[PDB]
């Protein structure tokens, strides 16, 4: 019915891809603690004192990945529900 | 720190093992030659590509160019 | 009446093909010559027995074998796997009677070269996932009508896309390319700043806010080979393009020369089977010698330079390309380029 | 044609201005202000080098495109009543791209030898850098123009052969002789561009 | 090689060679080639049957065209039949001609349709 399956299949695969990739990128940030090779982006113009501020900020950055994963998973569930409308 | 004789031995032995043993122990059927060619040419191309990629790094000439932020960060990550 | 349409086309074809028979009917000389393979003769004579069974004349309806010197047609007996790759080669040219079949080697060396051209991890994973989807659902899609002709020709190359994705995943692993970023798996060996402080390297990073501060090779513990692929540090180096260009150009040239020698060595089989001593003696030999002498030397020189010159010899490191230009132009300046190895003249 | 008239007007005005200016200056004993030395010594060698580098690929690509279209249009059009000619007549396109391949290789080769210097006046730069810049410009220009004309000739004969092949199968295999003889001039251009810059030691 | 020999000849004329060649075609593992003289297509021993077949195809093409203009889908999922060589086929084609003839008269009734428009146009001069 609403949000026909023809595009809902594509939506489901897209949501699965989003969940998986965002979760893995967040885990790579946290576990490796944002090695500059795998993590260039950040927001700090002053770090000359020590690395602890850098690590804290990179943890803060990596936190958002799991919120993105949750949103993608909810999207996938919504699309799966729309598929069941037959 | 990394070793060089150990990886070359391990990967050369693995690729010799597959590329030589696989052909000898195939079932006697209609798809024998196809699978033999597939596995053998696989092992050949695979191992050659790895060998070129690894020898291209042995005995480097000039080091990398690293930004100052990376120079600061690599202090307290690789150590 | 659609069934009648099928029947009408069938009898029309039957009469059209029976028209081809001989131009005489005396003594019942209505005969037509047929191309037929060897592995299917039993079914053919079984068909003849069926035809005589439908007939009330009770006659053998057979004739003896004969041979002439015409050109027989060729048929590639495909199965579920080799068909997708045989159709790809037949699209350009049809092999002669007993031509060296190129599908058995092509079936693998094609996705390998593709993966060299398309060496990325994530994209390869996506392609192999699509391959798995399309392979596993084959039965339903085959018994289904689809308006998308693009999808039909995509679906034709099932194992093509599968093997292509597999080798793409591999070559993504070997470059240490994964969505354009390396995966530091089991260690780096290049940058050690605490060891770098030994070599008069301190306080520079205050000016580091506006400079680049090159890293040298071998202040004592640097260098070293990564056991698998490209060292991840190269992925973040600003001058990565130079080394990547060198390595990729050399790999491409080496791959291309072995492909060609493969070609000519395979040709030698083609000629020796057909019993053509002239072609082997004054054909294959000069061409293979020419190919070898002209470029196997370049391959071996590249490998020698790779395994010979260390970091401390960075001054006046010989250049191979200029030596090849002098190979072609026969020019030997007294200076300007040192000999790569003694006795090169 | 308006565009041709515009081009002719600009060209004639330019040359008339040149002639009149030259004559009045020569009559006016002002030959000391025509010091071509300053004109060809103020110019940096790197400008000449980089112009040559750009042209050595640009003109080759232009020729490749010209030949590509000139043969492809006829190949595609003439196969409607003979689909057999699609794959038989792909040699011309291959050569039209081989021209650009040679151009790229030459660009890579000449791109070397670009070590900067610090001199800022003619007396300090020296003869060597001037020779380097001029030689590199000349090599780039000659390779570019040679490959351009080569590609055009290749494309024209490829079109002719492709169009003629649809009449009789036994034609193309012998009409390709002119096709193969096309590429020799581009090869000669590459050889001369190599030789002209074989003794540059800029740095 | 792909094959060892491919020019054996195991075919002889009979009074029902039609059934033999039909079953061989059903096998789908042979190809036919002959007539080196390259005689004209209208000097043939079997020209009359080809002409009859062409007539059947023309009639059949007309009826399927009319069906497709009716926008009536055709279903083709049944079995592959066997051709009835004996004279029964003749009777069948006779029936087919009757079908075509009906279509002819239907087009004659489309003459009536023209008359309709000769009045619908008339309605547009109501003013």
Nearest to residue B71, comparing CAs of C204, D1, D78? C204
Q: Which class for D200: exposed (0-12), middle (13-18), buried (19 or more C-beta within 10 A)?
A: buried
- Window 7-36 of A: residues touching C by CB (8 A cutoff) are 32, 35-36
**Which helix (H) or strand (E) is C184 found in, with range?**
none
Cβ within 8 Å, pair A36-C232:
no
Return d(Cα D76, Cα D54) in angstroms, integer: 33
Pairwise CA distance, residues C156 & C148, whole Å: 13
CB contact under 8 A, D198 and C331: yes
Number of other CB atoms surrounding residue C277 within 10 Å: 9
CB-based contact C186:C240 (threshold 8 Å): no
How far is the C-alpha of D104 from the C-alpha of D29, rounded, in Å?
Answer: 49
Take residue D29 and report the two structure tokens written for it. 């004993």
* Partners of E32 in beta bridges: C34
Neighbours of chain C (3+ CB pairs under 8 A): A, B, D, E
| Residue in C closest to A17 by C-alpha | C126
Q: Residue D135 — φ and ψ, nearest 5°?
A: -60, -40
A10 to chain B, any CB pair closer than 8 A? The answer is no
Sign of CA dihedral D95, D96, D97, D103: positive
Residue with structure tokens 């946290």?
A30
Between residues 85 and 104 of chain C, which touch chain E (CB distance below 8 Å)? Answer: 97-98
Touching, D vs C (3+ Cβ pairs under 8 A): yes
| Class of residue D179 by CB neighbours under 10 A (exposed 0-12, middle 13-18, buried 19+) | buried
Q: Which residues on A lie below 8 Å from B77 (Cβ)?
A: 33, 35-36
- CB neighbours of residue D73 within 10 Å: 14
Widest pairwise Cα distance in chain B: 63
**In this structure, are residues E74 and C46 in contact, taking their beta carbons and an 8 Å threshold?**
no
* Interface touch A33/B77, C-beta < 8 Å: yes
Residue C33 DSSP label: E
Strands (E), chain D: none
Q: Are C192 and C143 in contact (CB under 8 A)?
A: no
Tell me the C-alpha distance between D145 and D141, whole Å: 6
CB contact under 8 A, B53 and C81: no
Asked if E85 and E16 touch (Cβ cutoff 8 Å), the reply is yes
Cβ distance of C184 and A40 shorter than 8 Å: no
Give every CB contact of residue A79 below 8 A, 6+ residues apart in sequence: A3, A8, A11, A12, A15
| CB D126, CB D71: distance < 8 Å | no
43-62 of A, contacting B, C-beta below 8 A: 47, 51, 54
H or E stretch at D134: helix D127-165
d(CA C19, CA E41): 10
Give φ, ψ of B51 to 5 degrees. Answer: -65, -45
Whether chain B has a CB inside 8 Å of the CB on A7: the answer is no
Write phi, then psi, for C337 (nearest 5 degrees): -155, 115
Integer distance in angstroms from the first to the last C-alpha of chain B? 12
Distance CA D93, CA D106 (A): 20
**What is the DSSP code (8-state) at residue D166?**
T
**Rounded Cα gap, residues A34 and A44, in angstroms:** 14
Best B73, B74, B75 residue to mutate vs chain A (most A CBs within 10 Å): B73
Element (H, E) at C34: strand C33-35
Distance from CA of B18 to the nearest CA of A (A): 32
Distances (CA, A) of E45 to C32, C228, E40, E42, E48: 14, 76, 11, 9, 8
Q: Which tokens hold the place of D144? A: 């570019």
Closest CA to D143 of D198, D66, D196, D70: D196
- B66: containing domain: 1-78
Q: What percent of chain B is helix, strand and coil (3-state, nearest 5)?
A: 65, 0, 35
| Count of Cβ atoms closer than 10 Å to residue D189 Cβ | 26
The shortest CB-CB distance from D194 to any of C93, C325, C336 is to: C325
Q: What are phi and psi of D40, to 5 degrees?
A: -95, 10
Chains that touch B (3 or more CB pairs under 8 A): A, C
The chain D residue lying nearest C90, using CA atoms, is: D87
Chain breaks in chain E (C to N over 2.5 A) after: none
Q: What is the largest CA-CA distance in chain D?
A: 74
As a whole number of angstroms, the distance between CA D198 and CA C336 comes to 11
Residues in chain E: 127
Q: Is E103 an 8 Å CB contact of chain C?
A: no
Q: Residue D87 is nearest to which of C92, C329, C331, comparing CB atoms? A: C92
The residues facing E33 across adjacent strands are: C33
**Interchain proximity C227–B46, CB inside 8 Å:** no
- With H, G, I as helix, E, B as strand and everything else as coil, classify residue D111: helix
| Contact yes or no for E24/C51 (Cβ under 8 A) | yes
Q: Total domain count for chain B?
A: 1
What whole-number distance in Å separates Cα of residue D64 and Cα of residue D150?
Answer: 9
Q: Please give, one letter per residue, the 3-state secondary structure of C241-306.
A: HHHHHHHHHHHHHHHHHHHHHHHHHHHHHHHHHCCCHHHHHHHHHHHHHHHHHHHHHHHHHHHHHH
Query: To which residue do tokens 């079908």 refer?
Result: E99
C81: tokens are 């796997």
D53, D65, E93 from D56: Cα distances, Å: 5, 15, 75
Residues D183 and D26: beta-carbon distance below 8 Å: no
Q: How far apart are CA E31 and CA C329, in angstroms?
A: 59
What number of other Cβ atoms are within 10 A of residue C333's Cβ?
A: 10
Decide: C11 and E92 in contact? Cβ < 8 Å.
Answer: no
- List phi, psi (to 5°) of E32: -110, 145
Chain pair C-E, CB pairs under 8 angstroms: 202
Query: Does D198 contact C336 at a Cβ distance shorter than 8 Å?
Result: no
Of C5, C57, C63, the CB nearest to E9: C63
Short-list E92, E107, E113, CA closest to E62: E107
3-state SS class at C22: coil
- Cβ contacts of residue D27 below 8 Å, gap of 6+? none
What φ, ψ does residue C190 adopt, rounded to 5°? -100, -60
Which of A56, A76, A65 lies closest to A21, judged by CA?
A65
What distance in Å separates the CA atoms of residue D81 and residue D63, rounded to the nearest whole number? 30
Q: Give the DSSP per-residue string, C124-163.
A: HHHHHHHHHHHHHTHHHHHTS--S-HHHHHHHHTHHHHHH
> In whole angstroms, what is the distance from residue D67 CA to residue D156 CA?
7
- Three-state SS for chain E is CCCCCCCCCCCCCCCCHHHHHHHHHHHCCCEEECCCCCCCCCCCCCHHHHHHHHHHHHHHHHHHHHHHHCCCCCCCCCCCCCCCCCCHHHHHHHHHHHHHHHHHHHHHHHHHHHHHHHHHHHHCCCC
Q: Quick check: helix, strand or coil at residue C178?
A: strand
Q: What is the DSSP string of A22-78?
A: HHHHHHHHHHHT--TTT------S---S-SHHHHHHHHHHHHHHHHHHHHHHHHHHH
Contact state of C235 with A40 under an 8 Å Cβ cutoff: no
Q: Are E45 and C5 in contact (CB < 8 Å)? A: no
Give exposure, C229-238, as e/b (b: 16+ Cβ within 10 Å): bbbbbbbbbe
CA distance B60 to B64: 10
Q: Which residue of D has its CA nearest to C328?
A: D191
CA distance D188 to C152: 48
Strands (E) in B1-79, as ranges, are none
Token pair for residue A47? 């770090």
Q: At residue C188, what are phi and psi to the nearest 5 degrees?
A: -110, 160
Determine what percent of chain D falls in helix, strand and coil, rounding each to the nearest 5.
Answer: 80, 0, 20
DSSP H or E segment with residue C95: none
d(CA D97, CA D154): 11
Using an 8 Å CB-CB cutoff, list residues of chain C that contact chain D.
91-93, 321, 325, 329, 331, 336
Spatial separation of the C-alpha atoms in residues C270 and C101, rounded to whole Å = 10
Collect all residues with Cβ–Cβ distance below 8 Å to E12 and sequence separation of at least 6: C28, C31, C59, C60, C61, C62, C63
Token couple for C134: 């399309």
Residues 6+ apart with CB under 8 A from E28: none
B46 CB contacts (<8 Å, ≥6 apart)?
A: B15, C170
- List the single residue in C with minimal CA-CA distance to B30: C79
**CB within 8 Å: C236 and A32:** no
Pair D163, D74: CB distance under 8 Å: yes
Residues 22-81, chain C: which have Cβ within 8 Å of E?
22-23, 25, 28-38, 40-41, 43-45, 47-48, 50-52, 54-57, 59-68, 70, 72-77
Q: What is the C-alpha separation between A40 and A32, in angstroms, rounded? A: 13
- Give bridge partners of residue E31 from the DSSP assignment: C35
Q: How far is it, in rounded angstroms, from Cα C253 to Cα C300?
A: 12
Q: CB atoms < 10 A from the CB of A38, how many?
A: 18
In angstroms, rounded to a whole number, what is the distance separating the alpha carbons of residues A38 and C184?
Answer: 8
Residue A9 tokens, joined:
């299949």
Residue E76, CB half-sphere, CA atoms under 13 Å: how many? 10
Q: A36–B76: do the CB atoms touch at under 8 Å? A: no
Contact predicate C176/C229, CB 8 Å: yes
* Chain C residue nearest residue E39, CA to CA: C23
**Vertex D121, ends D117 and D123: CA angle to 5°?**
100
Q: What are C314's two structure tokens?
A: 């960075």
The answer to whether the beta carbons of residues C305 and C320 sit under 8 Å apart is yes
- Nearest-CA neighbor of B48 among D186, C257, E103, C56? C257
Distance (Å, whole) CA D191 – CA D184: 10
Which residues is chain D interrupted after (C–N above 2.5 Å)?
Answer: none
Backbone angles phi, psi at B13, to 5 degrees: -65, -40
Neighbours of C32 (CB within 10 A): 19
Judge whether E49 is closer than 8 Å to chain C, CB to CB.
yes
* Phi, psi (rounded to 5 degrees) for C116: -60, -35
Q: Is C62 left (phi over 0), alpha (psi -120 to 50) or beta?
A: beta
- DSSP for residue D196: H
Please answer yes or no on whether B76 and A51 come within 8 Å at the CB atom. yes
Most distant pair of Cα atoms in chain E: their distance: 88
What element of type H or E holds C35? strand C33-35
* Residue C235 in contact with partner chain A when CB distance is under 8 A: yes
Query: Which tokens is C83 given?
Result: 């068909």
Q: Does C128 touch chain A (CB under 8 A)?
A: no
Check if the beta carbon of residue C234 is closer than 8 Å to that of residue C240. Answer: yes
Q: How many other CB atoms are found less than 10 A from the CB of residue C102?
A: 16
What b/e string do you get for C310-320 counting C-beta neighbours within 10 Å, with b at 16 or more? ebeeeeeebee
With 0-12 / 13-18 / 19 or more C-beta atoms within 10 angstroms meaning exposed / middle / buried, residue D137 is buried
CA distance linking residue D82 with residue D165, whole number of Å: 10
* Residue B61 CA to its chain's centroid (Å): 22
CB of A18 closer than 8 Å to CB of A72: yes
Phi-psi region of D126 (alpha: psi -120 to 50; beta: other; left: phi over 0): left
Burial A40-76 (b: 16+ CB within 10 A, else e): eeeeeeeeeeeeeebeeebeebbeebeebbeebbebb
With contacts defined as CB-CB under 8 Å, which chain C residues touch E3?
37-38, 72
> Which residues, at least 6 apart from D154, have a Cβ–Cβ distance to it below 8 Å?
D67, D92, D95, D96, D99, D179, D182, D183
Residue C34, phi then psi, degrees to nearest 5 = -135, 135
End-to-end CA distance of chain A: 6
**14-53 in chain C: CB under 8 A from chain B:** none
Residue C184 corresponds to which tokens in the numbers above? 């530091």
Sequence-distant (6+) residues with CB within 8 A of D82 are D166
Contacts of C182 in chain A (CB under 8 A): 37-38
Say how far apart CA C134 and CA C118 lie, in whole Å: 21
Q: In chain A, what are the domain boundaries? A: 1-86
What 3-state DSSP class applies to D121? coil
């Amino acid at each position: 019915l609403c949000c026909g399956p023809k595009l809902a299949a594509c939506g489901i695969v897209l949501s699965a891809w989003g969940v998986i990739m965002l979760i893995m990128l967040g885990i790579f940030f946290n576990v490796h603690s944002a090695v500059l090779i795998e993590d260039v982006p950040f927001t700090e113009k002053d770090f000359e004192n020590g690395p602890q501020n850098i690590y804290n900020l990179y943890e803060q950055v990596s936190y958002n990945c799991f919120i993105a994963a949750g949103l993608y998973l909810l999207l996938g569930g919504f699309s799966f529900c729309q598929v069941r409308l037959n | 720190a990394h070793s060089f004789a150990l990886p070359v031995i391990i990967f050369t032995t693995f690729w010799g093992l597959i590329g030589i043993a696989g052909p000898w122990f195939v079932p006697k059927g209609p798809n024998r030659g196809v699978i033999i060619t597939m596995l053998v040419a696989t092992a050949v191309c695979c191992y050659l590509f790895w060998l070129i990629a690894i020898l291209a790094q042995l005995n480097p000439l000039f080091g990398p160019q690293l930004k100052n932020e990376t120079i600061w960060y690599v202090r307290f990550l690789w150590e | 009446i659609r069934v009648w349409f099928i029947k009408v086309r069938k009898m029309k074809a039957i009469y059209h093909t029976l028209n081809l028979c001989n131009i005489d009917v005396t003594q019942k000389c209505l005969i037509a010559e047929v191309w037929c393979p060897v592995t299917d003769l039993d079914s053919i004579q079984f068909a003849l027995r069926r035809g005589t069974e439908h007939s009330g004349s009770t006659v053998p309806s057979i004739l003896n074998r004969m041979q002439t010197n015409q050109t027989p047609p060729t048929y590639n007996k495909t199965n579920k796997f080799t068909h997708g790759f045989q159709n790809i080669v037949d699209a350009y040219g049809i092999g002669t009677y007993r031509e060296i079949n190129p599908a058995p080697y092509t079936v693998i060396t094609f996705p390998f070269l593709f993966a060299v051209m398309f060496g990325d991890f994530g994209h390869g994973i996506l392609m192999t996932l699509f391959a798995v989807w399309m392979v596993l659902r084959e039965s339903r899609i085959l018994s289904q009508k689809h308006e998308n002709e693009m999808f039909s020709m995509v679906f034709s190359g099932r194992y093509i896309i599968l093997l292509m994705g597999l080798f793409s995943i591999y070559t993504g692993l070997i470059y240490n390319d994964c969505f354009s970023k390396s995966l530091n798996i089991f260690g780096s060996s290049w940058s050690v700043r605490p060891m770098f402080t030994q070599g008069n390297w301190t306080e520079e990073t205050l000016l580091g806010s506006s400079v680049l501060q090159l890293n040298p090779a071998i202040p004592g513990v640097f260098g070293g080979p990564y056991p698998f692929g490209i060292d991840p540090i190269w992925n973040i180096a600003t001058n990565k393009l130079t080394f990547l260009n060198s390595f990729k150009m050399k790999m491409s040239v080496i791959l291309g020369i072995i492909h060609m020698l493969f070609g000519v060595s395979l040709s030698l089989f083609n000629h020796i089977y057909f019993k053509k001593p002239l072609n082997i003696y004054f054909g294959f030999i000069p061409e293979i010698i020419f190919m070898s002498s002209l470029f196997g030397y370049l391959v071996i020189l590249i490998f020698y330079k790779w395994t010979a010159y260390d970091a401390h010899s960075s001054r006046n490191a010989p250049s191979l390309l200029i030596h090849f230009i002098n190979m072609f132009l026969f020019s030997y300046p007294e200076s300007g380029n040192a000999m790569l190895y003694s006795g090169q003249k | 044609t308006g565009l041709e008239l515009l081009y002719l007007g600009i060209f004639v005005a330019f040359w008339a201005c040149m002639v009149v200016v030259g004559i009045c200056y020569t009559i006016f004993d002002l030959g000391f202000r025509f010091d071509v030395a300053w004109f060809l010594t103020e110019t940096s060698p790197f400008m000449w080098s980089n112009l040559g580098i750009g042209l050595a690929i640009s003109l080759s690509v232009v020729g490749a495109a010209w030949g590509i279209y000139i043969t492809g249009s006829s190949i595609i059009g003439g196969g409607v009543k003979a689909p057999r000619i699609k794959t038989k007549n792909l040699v011309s396109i291959i050569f039209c791209e081989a021209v650009a391949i040679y151009g790229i290789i030459m660009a890579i080769v000449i791109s070397n030898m670009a070590e900067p210097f610090s001199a800022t006046e003619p007396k300090a730069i020296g003869h060597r850098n001037y020779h380097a810049g001029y030689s590199m410009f000349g090599a780039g220009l000659t390779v570019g123009l040679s490959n351009l004309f080569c590609g055009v000739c290749v494309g024209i004969v490829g079109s002719g052969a492709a169009l003629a092949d649809a009449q009789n199968p036994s034609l193309f295999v012998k009409i390709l002789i002119v096709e193969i003889f096309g590429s020799a001039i581009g090869l000669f251009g590459v050889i001369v561009a190599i030789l002209q810059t074989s003794r540059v030691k800029m740095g | 090689r792909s094959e060892e020999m491919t020019l054996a000849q195991l075919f002889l004329q009979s009074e029902a060679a039609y059934c033999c060649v039909s079953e061989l075609g059903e096998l789908g593992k042979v190809q036919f080639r002959d007539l080196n003289p390259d005689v004209n297509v209208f000097q043939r021993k079997f020209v009359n049957e080809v002409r009859r077949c062409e007539e059947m195809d023309r009639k059949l093409r007309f009826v399927e065209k009319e069906i497709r203009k009716a926008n009536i889908p055709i279903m083709d999922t049944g079995e592959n039949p066997e051709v009835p060589f004996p004279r029964d086929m003749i009777d069948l084609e006779a029936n087919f001609e009757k079908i075509e003839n009906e279509l002819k008269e239907i087009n004659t009734n489309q003459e009536a349709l023209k008359r309709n428009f000769l009045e619908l146009t008339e309605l547009k001069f109501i003013l």
